[PDB]
Amino acid sequence: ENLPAGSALLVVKRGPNAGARFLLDQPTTTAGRHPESDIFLDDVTVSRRHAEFRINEGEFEVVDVGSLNGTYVNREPRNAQVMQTGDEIQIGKFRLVFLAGPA
Amino acid sequence: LDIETHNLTIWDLDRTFNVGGFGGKETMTLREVLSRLRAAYTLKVGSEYTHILDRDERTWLQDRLEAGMPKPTQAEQKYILQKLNAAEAFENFLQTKYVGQKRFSLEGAEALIPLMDSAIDTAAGQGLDEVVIGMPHRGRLNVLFNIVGKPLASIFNGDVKYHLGSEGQHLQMFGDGEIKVSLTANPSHLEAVNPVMEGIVRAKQDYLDKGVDGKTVVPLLLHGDAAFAGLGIVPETINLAKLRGYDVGGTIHIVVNNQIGFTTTPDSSRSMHYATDYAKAFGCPVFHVNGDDPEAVVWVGQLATEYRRRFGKDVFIDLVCYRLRGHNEADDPSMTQPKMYELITGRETVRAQYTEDLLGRGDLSNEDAEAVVRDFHDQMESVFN
Ligand SMILES: Cc1ncc(C[n+]2csc(CCOP(=O)(O)OP(=O)(O)O)c2C)c(N)n1
Ligand SMILES: [Mg+2]
């Protein structure tokens, strides 16, 4: 919409902090239960270091960094995946939706 | 249960007999018949169901018990290990950071946390609205943090924390279900919450107004073994279950059987064989389960919640565990029961035993195995920040 060019957005569909918005605009962004995480998701089901979101030549990827419960993209377990708009990402009991920006 | 009592010998083990549809077969050998009966009725789950009078509800239980516990997936297995890690992490924080909490310890009975979670999750998948919990002191703060979902800040800041009520939400890991969870207030007088909790559930059902086909608020009630057999309020409240103004669609009962009162043993506590023998007066099923086999505990929770929704009657679970410490802060339990506390002192925990069993069935990869170790350190660092 009014998002800067080359950026993207994640929005919490289901979870305690539902409606929260996060901005992907730097080469690596960390997500876990560690209090110094970029995307801080406090629950027993999330691991301290759980996944990273990486932007490489204007292309957005999710990567599992060794969690117990794993990461799911559209109710299917994955180790790495390139995301298209409107994809559901599950980290623990949190469910997030990915929205791209202008090119 | 001995083959000699029925005039059969070792010489009959490999002969074939007509069995009338047992194990979905017309014929079978005595060796095969004995194998199946022992797998179904003599391992980690003991069932009492043949006293029930209705033929359809006796056959439903028979078919499920003789099919056996389904083999759980790897994902399911790791979710059970994460709940045991959280339970034990919180017990350690309470014992170290605060004093006079030895009375209220859950050490010996940590499988309670995955049993309660199994039942609440099964109810969310059925599409129901709320679960109302009533219980005594033992394990209360653990249930507030791991089942209701309150923050640590809220718990640790008139009357004490051990008697006030709370509310929270339960989302479903591998589904799309949500459900409310409530905890009722109570005094130190044992079993006085039983009738008060039932009344709260009926008022909430009446407000939703969904008719006889409804009954969408589930009562979950926790007892101790000595109080359940001894106090008369317990059977007085079960007698209201099927009456016109009082029916709430069944109650799931959990008796925590740690084989001791305060300084008193079961021999001097009851004249019944089991503590859960009031069930045979009211025509309801009983499941006895070993508190050191967590996969069997999660199955019994599921089966009990499914029986309530189908038949609308009460169901009783006996969780056989032990009490690691004494009831007082500074009191020796070997003073009165020395022989029992020879067996208890210096055991491995249920968490430790289950971790050793998963890492020795060779299902897990190298990357997967490292993660199981690191999970217990994560839960600890989180609580002690
Ligand atoms: C009505 C009533 N009678 C007696 C007591 C005293 N009391 C406090 S704890 C306790 C022992 C209860 O043992 P049990 O029910 O087996 O559970 P445990 O605490 O061992 O888990 C007793 C008798 C009480 N609190 N309330
Ligand atoms: Mg007891």
Short mmCIF file of C-alpha atoms and ligand atoms in Angstrom, two decimals:
data_model
loop_
_atom_site.label_atom_id
_atom_site.label_comp_id
_atom_site.label_asym_id
_atom_site.label_seq_id
_atom_site.Cartn_x
_atom_site.Cartn_y
_atom_site.Cartn_z
CA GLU A 1 0.00 0.00 0.00
CA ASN A 2 2.12 2.98 1.35
CA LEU A 3 4.94 0.42 2.19
CA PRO A 4 8.44 1.50 0.97
CA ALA A 5 9.74 -0.30 -2.19
CA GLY A 6 11.61 -3.58 -1.38
CA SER A 7 9.95 -3.91 2.12
CA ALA A 8 7.25 -6.36 3.38
CA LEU A 9 4.93 -6.91 6.39
CA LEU A 10 3.83 -9.74 8.79
CA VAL A 11 0.48 -9.49 10.73
CA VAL A 12 -0.61 -11.79 13.64
CA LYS A 13 -3.86 -13.57 12.59
CA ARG A 14 -4.12 -15.93 15.66
CA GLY A 15 -2.39 -15.63 19.10
CA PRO A 16 -2.35 -13.57 22.36
CA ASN A 17 -1.07 -10.34 20.61
CA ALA A 18 -3.40 -10.73 17.54
CA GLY A 19 -3.46 -7.63 15.24
CA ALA A 20 0.25 -6.78 15.93
CA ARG A 21 2.21 -5.63 12.81
CA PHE A 22 5.98 -6.21 12.11
CA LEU A 23 8.14 -4.68 9.29
CA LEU A 24 10.69 -6.72 7.22
CA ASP A 25 13.14 -4.07 5.82
CA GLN A 26 16.70 -5.36 6.78
CA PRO A 27 18.75 -8.30 5.35
CA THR A 28 18.18 -10.60 8.44
CA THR A 29 15.39 -10.43 11.10
CA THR A 30 15.26 -12.96 14.01
CA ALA A 31 12.06 -14.40 15.60
CA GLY A 32 11.87 -16.34 18.92
CA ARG A 33 11.42 -16.26 22.75
CA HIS A 34 14.84 -14.59 23.38
CA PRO A 35 14.17 -11.05 24.72
CA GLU A 36 16.67 -9.50 22.20
CA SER A 37 14.75 -11.04 19.18
CA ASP A 38 13.51 -8.62 16.44
CA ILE A 39 10.04 -10.33 16.50
CA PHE A 40 9.48 -11.26 20.22
CA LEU A 41 6.82 -14.05 20.55
CA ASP A 42 6.50 -15.01 24.27
CA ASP A 43 5.00 -18.55 24.68
CA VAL A 44 6.21 -22.03 25.88
CA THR A 45 5.72 -23.47 22.32
CA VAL A 46 8.28 -21.01 20.76
CA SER A 47 12.08 -21.71 21.08
CA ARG A 48 14.63 -19.02 22.12
CA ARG A 49 16.06 -19.01 18.55
CA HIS A 50 13.26 -20.35 16.22
CA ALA A 51 13.43 -18.86 12.68
CA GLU A 52 14.97 -16.06 10.54
CA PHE A 53 13.42 -14.02 7.65
CA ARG A 54 16.02 -13.15 4.93
CA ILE A 55 15.76 -10.73 1.90
CA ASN A 56 18.09 -11.73 -1.03
CA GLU A 57 17.89 -9.87 -4.42
CA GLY A 58 14.30 -8.65 -3.75
CA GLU A 59 13.03 -12.11 -2.63
CA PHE A 60 11.71 -13.06 0.88
CA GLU A 61 12.60 -16.49 2.49
CA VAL A 62 11.73 -18.21 5.84
CA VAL A 63 14.38 -20.55 7.44
CA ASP A 64 14.12 -22.82 10.54
CA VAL A 65 17.27 -22.37 12.75
CA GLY A 66 16.81 -25.60 14.80
CA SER A 67 13.54 -25.41 16.81
CA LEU A 68 11.80 -28.34 18.57
CA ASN A 69 8.28 -27.86 17.08
CA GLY A 70 9.52 -26.68 13.62
CA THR A 71 8.08 -24.07 11.17
CA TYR A 72 4.97 -24.73 8.94
CA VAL A 73 4.08 -22.82 5.67
CA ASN A 74 0.40 -23.46 4.66
CA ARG A 75 -0.01 -26.36 7.18
CA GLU A 76 3.06 -28.23 5.73
CA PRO A 77 6.46 -28.61 7.51
CA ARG A 78 9.41 -26.85 5.75
CA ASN A 79 13.13 -26.14 6.53
CA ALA A 80 13.36 -23.26 4.00
CA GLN A 81 10.73 -21.70 1.66
CA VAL A 82 10.32 -18.52 -0.51
CA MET A 83 7.03 -16.79 0.50
CA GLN A 84 4.31 -15.45 -1.88
CA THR A 85 1.72 -12.87 -0.61
CA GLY A 86 -1.13 -14.21 1.57
CA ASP A 87 0.87 -17.25 2.90
CA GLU A 88 0.22 -18.45 6.51
CA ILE A 89 3.40 -19.08 8.65
CA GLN A 90 3.07 -21.05 11.98
CA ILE A 91 5.69 -20.55 14.80
CA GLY A 92 4.33 -22.41 17.87
CA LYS A 93 0.69 -21.41 18.55
CA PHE A 94 1.20 -18.06 16.68
CA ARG A 95 -0.07 -17.84 13.04
CA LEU A 96 1.15 -14.91 10.85
CA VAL A 97 0.19 -13.64 7.30
CA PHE A 98 2.80 -12.26 4.80
CA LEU A 99 2.02 -9.11 2.70
CA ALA A 100 4.52 -7.87 0.04
CA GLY A 101 5.20 -4.21 -0.95
CA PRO A 102 5.82 -2.33 -4.25
CA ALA A 103 8.79 -3.47 -6.46
CA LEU B 1 -6.85 -65.23 35.86
CA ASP B 2 -4.75 -68.49 35.96
CA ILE B 3 -5.43 -71.10 33.22
CA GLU B 4 -5.40 -73.91 35.88
CA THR B 5 -8.63 -72.46 37.43
CA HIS B 6 -10.46 -73.05 34.08
CA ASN B 7 -9.15 -76.66 33.55
CA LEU B 8 -6.65 -75.76 30.78
CA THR B 9 -2.93 -76.76 30.62
CA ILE B 10 0.28 -75.97 28.65
CA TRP B 11 -0.79 -78.78 26.25
CA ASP B 12 -3.69 -76.56 24.93
CA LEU B 13 -1.58 -73.50 23.94
CA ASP B 14 -1.18 -74.46 20.22
CA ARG B 15 -4.70 -75.97 19.74
CA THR B 16 -7.39 -73.87 17.92
CA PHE B 17 -10.80 -72.85 19.43
CA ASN B 18 -14.03 -70.98 18.45
CA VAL B 19 -13.98 -67.47 20.04
CA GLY B 20 -17.11 -65.79 18.56
CA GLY B 21 -15.73 -62.61 16.96
CA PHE B 22 -13.04 -61.84 19.59
CA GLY B 23 -10.31 -59.75 17.85
CA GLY B 24 -12.52 -59.82 14.71
CA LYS B 25 -11.93 -63.58 14.18
CA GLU B 26 -14.05 -66.78 14.39
CA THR B 27 -11.13 -69.13 15.34
CA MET B 28 -7.83 -68.52 17.24
CA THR B 29 -5.19 -70.44 19.31
CA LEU B 30 -5.02 -70.16 23.14
CA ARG B 31 -1.52 -68.62 22.81
CA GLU B 32 -2.92 -65.78 20.63
CA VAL B 33 -5.99 -65.31 22.95
CA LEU B 34 -3.74 -64.89 26.03
CA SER B 35 -1.43 -62.41 24.21
CA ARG B 36 -4.32 -60.12 23.22
CA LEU B 37 -6.02 -60.22 26.66
CA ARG B 38 -2.71 -59.28 28.38
CA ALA B 39 -1.98 -56.41 25.93
CA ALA B 40 -5.48 -54.93 26.47
CA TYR B 41 -6.11 -55.33 30.23
CA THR B 42 -2.74 -55.87 32.09
CA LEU B 43 -0.15 -53.19 30.96
CA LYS B 44 -0.22 -49.44 31.92
CA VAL B 45 -4.06 -48.91 31.78
CA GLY B 46 -6.55 -50.87 33.97
CA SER B 47 -10.29 -50.57 33.11
CA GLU B 48 -13.55 -51.27 35.04
CA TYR B 49 -16.58 -51.22 32.64
CA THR B 50 -18.52 -54.59 32.79
CA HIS B 51 -20.87 -53.42 35.61
CA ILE B 52 -22.55 -50.96 33.13
CA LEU B 53 -26.13 -52.12 32.27
CA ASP B 54 -26.61 -50.63 28.73
CA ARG B 55 -25.27 -53.00 26.00
CA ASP B 56 -24.45 -50.23 23.45
CA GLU B 57 -22.24 -48.21 25.87
CA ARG B 58 -20.49 -51.42 27.14
CA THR B 59 -19.63 -52.38 23.50
CA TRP B 60 -18.26 -48.87 22.65
CA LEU B 61 -15.69 -49.08 25.51
CA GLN B 62 -14.82 -52.75 24.75
CA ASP B 63 -14.00 -52.01 21.08
CA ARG B 64 -11.75 -49.00 21.91
CA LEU B 65 -9.82 -50.74 24.75
CA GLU B 66 -9.16 -53.92 22.66
CA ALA B 67 -7.99 -51.90 19.59
CA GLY B 68 -5.30 -50.32 21.83
CA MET B 69 -3.57 -46.91 22.15
CA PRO B 70 -2.74 -45.53 18.66
CA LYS B 71 1.02 -45.08 17.88
CA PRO B 72 1.70 -41.32 18.27
CA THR B 73 3.64 -39.29 15.63
CA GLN B 74 7.07 -37.70 16.27
CA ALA B 75 5.55 -34.18 16.41
CA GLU B 76 3.01 -35.37 19.04
CA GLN B 77 5.84 -37.02 21.07
CA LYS B 78 7.92 -33.81 21.17
CA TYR B 79 4.88 -31.73 22.30
CA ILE B 80 4.44 -34.10 25.35
CA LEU B 81 8.16 -33.64 26.21
CA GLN B 82 7.88 -29.82 26.07
CA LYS B 83 4.97 -29.82 28.61
CA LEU B 84 6.95 -32.05 31.05
CA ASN B 85 9.97 -29.70 30.67
CA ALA B 86 7.81 -26.66 31.58
CA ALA B 87 6.21 -28.42 34.58
CA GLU B 88 9.62 -29.38 36.08
CA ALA B 89 11.18 -25.96 35.29
CA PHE B 90 8.46 -24.16 37.31
CA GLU B 91 8.78 -26.54 40.32
CA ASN B 92 12.53 -25.68 40.46
CA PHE B 93 11.85 -21.89 40.36
CA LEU B 94 9.30 -22.11 43.21
CA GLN B 95 11.56 -24.23 45.51
CA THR B 96 14.64 -21.96 44.99
CA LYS B 97 13.27 -18.36 44.77
CA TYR B 98 10.58 -18.69 47.55
CA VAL B 99 10.20 -20.47 50.96
CA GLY B 100 7.42 -22.58 52.60
CA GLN B 101 6.25 -23.98 49.19
CA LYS B 102 7.19 -27.68 49.96
CA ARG B 103 3.55 -28.29 51.14
CA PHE B 104 2.23 -27.23 47.67
CA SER B 105 4.72 -29.24 45.50
CA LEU B 106 3.63 -31.38 42.51
CA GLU B 107 6.92 -33.39 42.50
CA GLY B 108 5.91 -37.04 41.94
CA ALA B 109 2.75 -36.10 39.96
CA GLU B 110 4.04 -34.01 37.01
CA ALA B 111 1.97 -36.06 34.50
CA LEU B 112 -1.13 -34.15 35.74
CA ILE B 113 -0.10 -31.23 33.44
CA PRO B 114 -0.15 -33.24 30.18
CA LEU B 115 -3.43 -35.06 31.26
CA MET B 116 -5.37 -31.80 31.85
CA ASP B 117 -3.98 -30.39 28.54
CA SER B 118 -5.19 -33.50 26.61
CA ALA B 119 -8.79 -33.15 27.91
CA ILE B 120 -9.02 -29.34 27.29
CA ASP B 121 -7.66 -29.81 23.73
CA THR B 122 -10.16 -32.64 22.95
CA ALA B 123 -13.02 -30.34 24.17
CA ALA B 124 -11.84 -27.53 21.83
CA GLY B 125 -12.00 -29.93 18.85
CA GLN B 126 -15.58 -30.96 19.78
CA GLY B 127 -16.56 -27.26 19.43
CA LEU B 128 -17.51 -26.49 23.08
CA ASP B 129 -17.49 -23.05 24.81
CA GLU B 130 -15.75 -23.23 28.27
CA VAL B 131 -13.99 -25.54 30.83
CA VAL B 132 -14.50 -24.77 34.60
CA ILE B 133 -11.82 -26.25 36.99
CA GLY B 134 -12.15 -26.90 40.76
CA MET B 135 -9.21 -28.27 42.80
CA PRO B 136 -7.24 -28.14 46.09
CA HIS B 137 -3.82 -26.53 47.00
CA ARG B 138 -1.42 -29.18 45.56
CA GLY B 139 -0.17 -28.00 42.14
CA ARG B 140 -2.34 -24.87 41.94
CA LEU B 141 0.31 -22.32 40.87
CA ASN B 142 1.62 -24.84 38.27
CA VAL B 143 -1.94 -25.06 36.78
CA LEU B 144 -2.19 -21.22 36.76
CA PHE B 145 1.03 -20.90 34.64
CA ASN B 146 0.85 -23.97 32.31
CA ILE B 147 -2.96 -24.54 31.80
CA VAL B 148 -4.80 -21.19 32.38
CA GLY B 149 -1.89 -19.19 30.88
CA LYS B 150 -1.33 -16.30 33.33
CA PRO B 151 2.02 -14.41 33.15
CA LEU B 152 4.70 -14.87 35.89
CA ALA B 153 4.41 -11.14 36.80
CA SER B 154 0.65 -11.58 37.54
CA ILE B 155 1.15 -14.69 39.80
CA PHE B 156 3.96 -13.18 41.98
CA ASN B 157 3.17 -9.65 43.35
CA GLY B 158 -7.50 -10.23 51.88
CA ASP B 159 -6.17 -13.74 50.96
CA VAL B 160 -3.29 -15.64 49.20
CA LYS B 161 -2.75 -16.70 45.50
CA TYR B 162 -3.68 -20.33 46.49
CA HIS B 163 -7.42 -19.43 46.97
CA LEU B 164 -8.29 -16.68 44.33
CA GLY B 165 -9.90 -17.38 40.88
CA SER B 166 -8.64 -16.65 37.29
CA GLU B 167 -9.63 -16.75 33.55
CA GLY B 168 -7.71 -17.44 30.27
CA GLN B 169 -7.82 -18.78 26.64
CA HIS B 170 -6.55 -22.13 25.18
CA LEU B 171 -5.63 -22.25 21.45
CA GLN B 172 -5.14 -25.64 19.72
CA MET B 173 -1.62 -26.42 18.29
CA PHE B 174 -2.69 -28.82 15.46
CA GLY B 175 -6.24 -27.50 14.75
CA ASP B 176 -8.39 -24.32 14.50
CA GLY B 177 -10.21 -24.57 17.90
CA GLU B 178 -10.25 -22.08 20.84
CA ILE B 179 -11.85 -22.51 24.34
CA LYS B 180 -12.16 -20.40 27.56
CA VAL B 181 -10.62 -21.81 30.82
CA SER B 182 -11.77 -20.67 34.34
CA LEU B 183 -10.50 -21.56 37.88
CA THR B 184 -12.93 -21.31 40.87
CA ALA B 185 -12.20 -19.84 44.37
CA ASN B 186 -12.33 -22.18 47.42
CA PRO B 187 -11.49 -22.49 51.14
CA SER B 188 -9.08 -24.92 52.91
CA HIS B 189 -12.09 -27.13 53.93
CA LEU B 190 -11.62 -30.12 51.56
CA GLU B 191 -14.34 -30.98 48.96
CA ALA B 192 -16.59 -27.94 49.77
CA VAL B 193 -16.04 -26.63 46.15
CA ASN B 194 -17.78 -29.72 44.63
CA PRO B 195 -21.42 -28.46 44.70
CA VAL B 196 -20.43 -24.76 44.12
CA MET B 197 -18.54 -25.61 40.87
CA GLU B 198 -21.52 -27.66 39.49
CA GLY B 199 -23.89 -24.71 40.05
CA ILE B 200 -21.52 -22.29 38.20
CA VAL B 201 -21.57 -24.65 35.16
CA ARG B 202 -25.42 -24.90 35.11
CA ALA B 203 -25.84 -21.09 35.23
CA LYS B 204 -23.46 -20.67 32.23
CA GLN B 205 -25.25 -23.42 30.23
CA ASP B 206 -28.66 -21.73 30.90
CA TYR B 207 -27.37 -18.33 29.60
CA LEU B 208 -26.22 -19.81 26.24
CA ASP B 209 -29.66 -21.48 25.74
CA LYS B 210 -28.88 -24.32 23.25
CA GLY B 211 -31.35 -27.00 24.53
CA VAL B 212 -30.85 -30.71 25.47
CA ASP B 213 -28.50 -31.30 22.44
CA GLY B 214 -26.20 -28.53 23.89
CA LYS B 215 -24.45 -28.87 27.31
CA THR B 216 -21.30 -27.05 26.07
CA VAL B 217 -19.54 -26.08 29.37
CA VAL B 218 -17.36 -28.96 30.74
CA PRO B 219 -16.75 -29.45 34.49
CA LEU B 220 -13.21 -30.79 35.36
CA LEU B 221 -12.83 -31.61 39.11
CA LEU B 222 -9.55 -32.66 40.88
CA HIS B 223 -9.55 -34.61 44.22
CA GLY B 224 -7.04 -36.27 46.60
CA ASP B 225 -7.41 -39.99 47.46
CA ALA B 226 -8.04 -39.69 51.24
CA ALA B 227 -10.63 -36.87 50.92
CA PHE B 228 -12.50 -38.66 48.08
CA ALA B 229 -13.15 -41.88 50.09
CA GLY B 230 -13.76 -40.19 53.46
CA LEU B 231 -15.94 -37.05 53.19
CA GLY B 232 -19.68 -37.58 52.47
CA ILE B 233 -20.14 -34.40 50.34
CA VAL B 234 -18.43 -36.30 47.43
CA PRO B 235 -21.15 -38.97 46.84
CA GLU B 236 -23.96 -36.50 47.86
CA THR B 237 -22.99 -34.25 44.86
CA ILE B 238 -22.64 -37.17 42.33
CA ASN B 239 -26.29 -38.10 43.20
CA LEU B 240 -27.49 -34.78 41.63
CA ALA B 241 -26.02 -35.71 38.19
CA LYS B 242 -29.18 -37.01 36.41
CA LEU B 243 -31.88 -34.92 38.23
CA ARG B 244 -34.02 -32.35 36.40
CA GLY B 245 -32.80 -28.98 37.73
CA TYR B 246 -29.17 -30.11 38.31
CA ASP B 247 -27.97 -32.02 35.14
CA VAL B 248 -24.88 -30.51 33.36
CA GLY B 249 -24.04 -33.32 30.86
CA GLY B 250 -21.45 -35.24 32.94
CA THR B 251 -18.37 -34.42 35.10
CA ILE B 252 -14.73 -35.54 34.38
CA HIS B 253 -13.18 -36.52 37.80
CA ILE B 254 -9.35 -36.87 38.36
CA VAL B 255 -8.22 -38.53 41.67
CA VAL B 256 -4.46 -37.98 42.38
CA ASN B 257 -3.55 -41.20 44.26
CA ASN B 258 -0.14 -40.62 45.94
CA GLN B 259 -0.78 -43.51 48.38
CA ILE B 260 -0.70 -41.26 51.57
CA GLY B 261 -2.93 -38.67 53.37
CA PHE B 262 -0.76 -36.52 55.74
CA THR B 263 0.86 -39.11 58.13
CA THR B 264 -1.93 -41.69 57.33
CA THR B 265 -1.86 -44.69 54.86
CA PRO B 266 -4.77 -46.16 52.78
CA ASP B 267 -5.25 -49.10 55.28
CA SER B 268 -6.49 -46.56 57.92
CA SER B 269 -8.35 -44.29 55.40
CA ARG B 270 -10.97 -46.47 53.61
CA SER B 271 -12.91 -49.80 53.70
CA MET B 272 -13.13 -49.93 49.83
CA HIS B 273 -10.44 -51.73 47.69
CA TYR B 274 -9.87 -48.66 45.42
CA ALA B 275 -10.64 -44.99 46.30
CA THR B 276 -12.76 -44.66 43.10
CA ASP B 277 -15.28 -47.44 44.03
CA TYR B 278 -18.23 -44.96 44.37
CA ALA B 279 -18.31 -45.18 40.52
CA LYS B 280 -19.83 -48.72 40.75
CA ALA B 281 -22.79 -47.30 42.78
CA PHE B 282 -23.69 -44.80 40.00
CA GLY B 283 -22.97 -47.05 36.97
CA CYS B 284 -19.96 -45.13 35.49
CA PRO B 285 -16.58 -46.25 34.00
CA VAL B 286 -13.13 -46.08 35.79
CA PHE B 287 -9.63 -45.88 34.14
CA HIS B 288 -6.52 -46.54 36.35
CA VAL B 289 -3.28 -45.20 34.71
CA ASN B 290 0.46 -45.28 35.65
CA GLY B 291 1.88 -41.79 36.19
CA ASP B 292 5.34 -42.72 34.78
CA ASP B 293 4.05 -43.49 31.20
CA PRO B 294 3.12 -40.12 29.66
CA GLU B 295 1.80 -41.47 26.28
CA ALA B 296 -0.78 -43.64 28.15
CA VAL B 297 -1.85 -40.62 30.28
CA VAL B 298 -2.61 -38.45 27.17
CA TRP B 299 -4.72 -41.30 25.65
CA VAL B 300 -6.93 -41.74 28.78
CA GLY B 301 -7.61 -37.96 28.81
CA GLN B 302 -8.86 -38.11 25.19
CA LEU B 303 -11.00 -41.27 25.69
CA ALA B 304 -12.74 -39.83 28.81
CA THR B 305 -13.66 -36.53 27.05
CA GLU B 306 -15.08 -38.52 24.06
CA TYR B 307 -17.19 -40.76 26.41
CA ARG B 308 -18.76 -37.67 28.08
CA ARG B 309 -19.88 -36.13 24.74
CA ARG B 310 -21.46 -39.39 23.43
CA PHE B 311 -23.31 -40.65 26.57
CA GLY B 312 -23.63 -37.59 28.89
CA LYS B 313 -22.52 -39.39 32.10
CA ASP B 314 -19.71 -39.03 34.71
CA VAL B 315 -16.23 -40.59 34.13
CA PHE B 316 -13.46 -41.27 36.74
CA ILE B 317 -9.61 -41.29 36.16
CA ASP B 318 -7.24 -42.66 38.91
CA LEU B 319 -3.65 -41.30 38.39
CA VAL B 320 -1.23 -43.50 40.44
CA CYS B 321 1.87 -41.44 41.43
CA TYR B 322 3.79 -40.65 44.70
CA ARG B 323 4.66 -37.70 47.04
CA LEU B 324 8.45 -36.96 46.96
CA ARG B 325 8.68 -34.58 50.00
CA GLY B 326 6.69 -34.34 53.30
CA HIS B 327 3.46 -32.25 53.74
CA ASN B 328 5.16 -29.84 56.27
CA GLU B 329 8.08 -27.50 55.27
CA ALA B 330 10.45 -29.13 57.87
CA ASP B 331 8.99 -32.65 58.61
CA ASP B 332 10.51 -36.15 57.90
CA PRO B 333 8.02 -38.61 56.24
CA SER B 334 10.36 -41.60 57.12
CA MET B 335 9.49 -40.91 60.85
CA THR B 336 6.06 -42.69 60.30
CA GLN B 337 6.40 -44.46 56.84
CA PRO B 338 10.08 -45.63 56.66
CA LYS B 339 9.58 -48.63 54.24
CA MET B 340 7.65 -46.58 51.58
CA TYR B 341 10.27 -43.73 51.58
CA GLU B 342 13.15 -46.24 50.99
CA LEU B 343 11.60 -46.80 47.48
CA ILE B 344 10.90 -43.03 46.88
CA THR B 345 14.27 -41.38 47.82
CA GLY B 346 16.86 -41.14 44.97
CA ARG B 347 14.70 -41.98 41.88
CA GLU B 348 14.87 -40.56 38.32
CA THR B 349 12.12 -38.00 37.38
CA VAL B 350 9.36 -38.77 34.77
CA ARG B 351 10.95 -36.16 32.42
CA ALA B 352 14.37 -37.88 32.62
CA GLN B 353 12.90 -41.34 32.02
CA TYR B 354 10.88 -40.21 28.95
CA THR B 355 13.87 -38.38 27.37
CA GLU B 356 16.00 -41.56 27.72
CA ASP B 357 13.22 -43.67 26.08
CA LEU B 358 12.87 -41.37 23.00
CA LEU B 359 16.69 -41.08 22.42
CA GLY B 360 16.91 -44.92 22.55
CA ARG B 361 14.28 -45.93 19.93
CA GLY B 362 16.47 -44.42 17.14
CA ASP B 363 13.54 -42.56 15.42
CA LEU B 364 15.27 -39.14 15.95
CA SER B 365 18.00 -37.71 13.61
CA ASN B 366 21.25 -35.94 14.73
CA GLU B 367 19.72 -32.40 14.36
CA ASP B 368 16.44 -33.59 16.06
CA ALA B 369 18.33 -35.17 19.01
CA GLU B 370 20.31 -31.94 19.83
CA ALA B 371 16.99 -30.00 20.02
CA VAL B 372 15.49 -32.31 22.73
CA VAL B 373 18.49 -31.46 25.02
CA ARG B 374 18.35 -27.68 24.38
CA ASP B 375 14.58 -27.38 25.14
CA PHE B 376 15.03 -27.93 28.93
CA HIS B 377 17.73 -25.19 29.09
CA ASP B 378 15.43 -22.76 27.16
CA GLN B 379 12.43 -23.23 29.54
CA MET B 380 14.76 -22.69 32.59
CA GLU B 381 16.40 -19.49 31.20
CA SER B 382 12.90 -18.06 30.43
CA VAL B 383 11.46 -18.55 33.98
CA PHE B 384 14.63 -17.20 35.75
CA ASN B 385 15.02 -13.96 33.65
C1 LIG C 1 -12.78 -30.69 55.78
C2 LIG C 1 -11.33 -30.85 56.10
N1 LIG C 1 -10.99 -31.83 56.95
C3 LIG C 1 -9.68 -31.93 57.23
C4 LIG C 1 -8.70 -31.11 56.71
C5 LIG C 1 -7.27 -31.23 57.14
N2 LIG C 1 -6.33 -31.63 56.06
C6 LIG C 1 -5.59 -30.78 55.38
S1 LIG C 1 -4.61 -31.53 54.25
C7 LIG C 1 -5.23 -33.08 54.70
C8 LIG C 1 -4.76 -34.33 54.00
C9 LIG C 1 -5.48 -34.58 52.70
O1 LIG C 1 -4.87 -35.72 52.04
P1 LIG C 1 -5.29 -36.15 50.53
O2 LIG C 1 -6.71 -35.82 50.26
O3 LIG C 1 -4.98 -37.63 50.38
O4 LIG C 1 -4.31 -35.37 49.54
P2 LIG C 1 -2.76 -34.99 49.45
O5 LIG C 1 -2.66 -33.61 50.11
O6 LIG C 1 -1.90 -36.02 50.09
O7 LIG C 1 -2.49 -34.83 47.95
C10 LIG C 1 -6.14 -32.96 55.69
C11 LIG C 1 -6.88 -34.06 56.38
C12 LIG C 1 -9.17 -30.10 55.81
N3 LIG C 1 -8.34 -29.23 55.22
N4 LIG C 1 -10.48 -29.99 55.52
MG MG C 2 -3.18 -38.35 48.93
#
